[PDB]
Curated annotation (Swiss-Prot), chain A:
This is Spike protein S2'. It comes from the Viruses. Subunit of the fusion protein that is processed upon entry into the host cell. Mediates fusion of the virion and cellular membranes by functioning as a class I viral fusion protein. Contains a viral fusion peptide that is unmasked after S2 cleavage. This cleavage can occur at the cell membrane by host TMPRSS2 or during endocytosis by host CSTL. In either case, this triggers an extensive and irreversible conformational change that leads to fusion of the viral envelope with the cellular cytoplasmic membrane, releasing viral genomic RNA into the host cell cytoplasm.
Length: 49, 49
C-alpha cells in the first residue's frame, strides 16, 4: 500500500509527517510477513518433531 | 473539560502570508529560520487581525 518499497525514497520525498504515514504501511505489512513466516515454521516444526 | 499541568504561551506578530508556515511539519521562511514548531507539537494556534 505504500508509495514505494524503499524506505529512503519515502523519507527523501514526503515531508516528515507525510512520510510516517507511508512508512507505517511498510512496517505494518512487513510485520505481517514475519508473522506468516514464523507461523508456518512453528507448524512445520511440529511435523518434523 | 480537560486541563493540563504547565501552559506555555508564545506571543508574537508576523505577516499574513507567513502564518500558514507555523505548524507541525511545515517549512518556510519562518519554520526554517526564526520560529519553528516541532513535528509532534501538541497545542493550539490562535491568530487575529
Amino acid at each position: 500500500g505504500a508509495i514505494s518499497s524503499v524506505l529512503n525514497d519515502i523519507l527523501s520525498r514526503l515531508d516528515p509527517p507525510e512520510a510516517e504515514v507511508q512508512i507505517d504501511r511498510l512496517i505494518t505489512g512487513r510485520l505481517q510477513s514475519l508473522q506468516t513466516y514464523v507461523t508456518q515454521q512453528l507448524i512445520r516444526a511440529a511435523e518434523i518433531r | 473539560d480537560l486541563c493540563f499541568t504547565n501552559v506555555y504561551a508564545d506571543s508574537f506578530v508576523i505577516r499574513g502570508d507567513e502564518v500558514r508556515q507555523i505548524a507541525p511539519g511545515q517549512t518556510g521562511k519562518i519554520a526554517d529560520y526564526n520560529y519553528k514548531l516541532p513535528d509532534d507539537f501538541t497545542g493550539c494556534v490562535i491568530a487575529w487581525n
